[PDB]
Structures are given as structure tokens and as C-alpha cells.
Design a protein around this ligand. Structure first.
Ligand code: ATP
Ligand code: ATP
Ligand code: ATP
Ligand code: AKG
Ligand code: AKG
Ligand code: AKG
Ligand code: MG
Ligand code: MG
Ligand code: MG
Lengths: 106, 107, 111
């Protein structure tokens, strides 16, 4: 299991969501963040820009799927399109039922 | 060391916090997020986000099952959307005020 | 690759941003969070555990930069009073820059 964290432009949320659900990736967590990349917030002094952070936990088999769909959906081709961080998840538990791992993600 | 990340119904934060603290787990970070799971935002094609709270608690390996059990007992209501919990590795914890590390930075 | 998460006092954001960028650490994500540590949101006695406003910094870097990031975070954010903050380091398997599809070292670099 992996966690996928993607920072994207806020207006791209809808397209990203649709692309993931259509590919059978259903379950994600969204929050509001500010940030900068290599260009230090310049569309020198350094600025933070509004972004959205998507968090998506899946089975290792699905990681490349999640990455492609976000990239396809979030790319405009201008600087500040986002960045994606894949990190390990040791264990997932659904709270309602107590199911673990594969059963908690499907 | 591990990070436990629990997404829960917002109203359940108080109970969750007291349960954790009374079990000796003391240090957590909370943020407002939106989300959906399997049922796509529906309690009732469409997919919607609902407001959830995300709890992050970094603890030692030996405390993980305690954190999980306490969050589950406090957070469950019995209905879809009760939450989900992810445990992930943490290499290093550092207390900024003293520069203390790891077990002494969590204790 | 490591993710550094630092929970700091909100008014320290600028000092941290300056210290880090000047050390060659350029790329960061900030969010608003609430928290308590060992002293349970406190500072007469007091009985409720309270959440206080904090900022979460997330900085992904190459392994060779972890020490610099911690040093600069400590120096910028410390005040000597409780609640100064906590830093968590955790592994990153893969980084992808969405504009180009560059990965890992390229996608963390300034190039
Ligand atoms: N190393 C990093 N660590 C944590 N967050 C980062 C990092 N790099 C970028 N971010 C976050 O991702 C957002 C998007 O970054 P961005 O797309 O600007 O990356 P970039 O490397 O500058 O690529 P580009 O050249 O296409 O702009 C940033 O505003 C910030 O939130
Ligand atoms: N795979 C996932 N990745 C990231 N976040 C998730 C995932 N699944 C759920 N979440 C987050 O946890 C929240 C609660 O999920 P929820 O409890 O509805 O999970 P579920 O698997 O659908 O279980 P249930 O059948 O009990 O609803 C979601 O709104 C979302 O924020
Ligand atoms: N074990 C933990 N897990 C998750 N978040 C934590 C933990 N400990 C602290 N935090 C977060 O970091 C913030 C600052 O912590 P704080 O500096 O008060 O740590 P401390 O251990 O109490 O050290 P000090 O004695 O200097 O106050 C908290 O408000 C909370 O957001
Ligand atoms: O965030 C943007 O839209 C442009 C600025 C940028 O790419 C950056 O700060 O890295
Ligand atoms: O989040 C809720 O309270 C109901 C919706 C749900 O369970 C889901 O989207 O998976
Ligand atoms: O967060 C603060 O500024 C003081 C309270 C504190 O240190 C804590 O809850 O651990
Ligand atoms: Mg950029
Ligand atoms: Mg659900
Ligand atoms: Mg404290």
C-alpha cells in the first residue's frame, strides 16, 4: 500500500476527481494548502500560492494508475502544475467495520 | 516510530481526543479536510466531498494498537463515512525547543 | 528522498521560509492546523486539553539535505517557550513533477 500526495492547481480538482473515479480509484482526501516550487511563487522575494493537496491511498498495483490519471488531469503545461509524492503505508483500517489493508482500500 | 492518520466525522474529535489523552497518548495535530470513500459522498453518477477531520498522531511502535483501538471506539457510529486510518513509518522525530530526538521527543 | 514535516508557531512562517530558501531548500507546502503536545494546549491551573493554532510545513528533499532542513527549521522557529514545535521525517519512494513528468532527483532539483 502507498499514499499518493499530489499538490495541484485548485481549479483542476474536478477533473482530477473524475479521472480517478472513472479509473476505479474511489477514496480521497482533499485539503487547502499554500506553497511554492523552484520559482519561489513567481507567476527575488518569495511567495506562497494557493494549491490543493490530494491524498490517495491505494494498493501498490494501482500506484502508476493514480499517477498517470492525476498528471493527465492536472497538467496545463505552465509552471506550478504540481508535484506528486508517493510514500509507504504500513496499515489501513476502515473505522466502521475494523477491516484492515486490502479490504479497507478496495 | 509511526504516524497514525485518522480521518473522522468532525463531531467525534472531542471523544477521540479524550480517549487518546486518557490512554497516555499526548500530542496530536488536526486539520479540516474534505473527502469521500467508497460511496462517493452519498448517504442517500454523482461524487461529492464531505467535511471530515484529519488527526495525525506520531507515537512509538508499541503504542500503535492503542491509538488505533482508541480512535475506533471513540469514532465509530455504525454508519458509512465513520472514517479510515493509515499508519506510515516515521524515521525521526525532533522537538524544536530542545533539539531532543525520538522517544524523548514523543514521551 | 524524505518528507520533513514541521509543526511551528504561525508567526514564524516567514523566518523559516527565508532561512530555508537561503540554504538552498526551495519547494514547500504550508497548511493551517491545530494541535497540542505534551502540555495539552496550556501555559492558576487549567483542565481542558485545547488545540492551538499552528502551521504545518512539508518539505521534500534529497537525503543529503535532511540535516540542513532540520538545522534551519530549529534556528528559525525556536523561541525557548513550550509549543515551539516538532519535526517529523519520513520516507518518500517517488517524486513526480506534473508539468514535465520528471521524477525523483530532477523533480526535486531546481533544474
Ligand atoms: N520539494 C517540495 N516539497 C514540498 N512541497 C513542494 C516541493 N516542491 C513543490 N512543492 C509543492 O507543490 C506545488 C507545485 O510545485 P511546482 O509545480 O511549482 O513545482 P516545480 O518544481 O516548481 O515545477 P514547475 O517548474 O513546473 O513549476 C508547490 O506550490 C508546493 O506546494
Ligand atoms: N483510499 C483512501 N485514500 C485517502 N482517503 C480516504 C480513502 N478512503 C477514505 N478516505 C478518507 O476517509 C474518509 C472516510 O472514508 P469512509 O469511512 O467513507 O471509508 P469507506 O472505505 O468508504 O468505509 P465505509 O464503507 O464505512 O464508508 C473519506 O471521506 C476520505 O476523506
Ligand atoms: N506526538 C505527536 N504527534 C502529532 N503531532 C504532534 C505530536 N507532538 C506534537 N505535535 C504537534 O506539534 C505541535 C507543537 O508541539 P510542541 O512543541 O508543544 O511539542 P512538545 O513535545 O510539547 O515540546 P515542548 O515541551 O517544547 O512544548 C503540537 O501543537 C501538535 O500540532
Ligand atoms: O505556482 C505557480 O502557479 C507558479 C509558480 C511556481 O511554479 C513555483 O513557485 O514553483
Ligand atoms: O462520509 C459520509 O458520512 C458518507 C459518505 C461515504 O461513506 C463515502 O463517501 O465513502
Ligand atoms: O502550543 C503552545 O504554544 C503551548 C502549549 C504546548 O506546548 C502543548 O500543548 O504541548
Ligand atoms: Mg514551479
Ligand atoms: Mg464511505
Ligand atoms: Mg508542548
Amino acid at each position: 500500500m502507498k499514499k499518493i500526495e499530489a499538490i495541484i492547481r485548485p481549479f483542476k480538482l474536478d477533473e482530477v476527481k473524475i479521472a480517478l473515479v472513472n479509473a476505479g480509484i474511489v477514496g480521497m482526501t482533499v485539503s487547502e494548502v499554500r506553497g511554492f516550487g523552484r520559482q519561489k511563487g513567481q507567476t527575488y522575494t518569495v511567495e506562497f500560492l494557493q494549491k490543493l493537496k490530494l491524498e490517495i491511498v491505494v494498493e501498490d498495483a494501482q500506484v502508476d494508475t493514480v499517477i498517470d490519471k492525476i498528471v493527465a488531469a492536472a497538467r496545463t503545461g505552465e509552471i506550478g502544475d504540481g508535484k506528486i509524492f508517493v510514500s509507504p503505508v504500513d496499515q489501513t483500517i476502515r473505522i466502521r467495520t475494523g477491516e484492515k489493508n486490502a479490504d479497507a482500500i478496495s
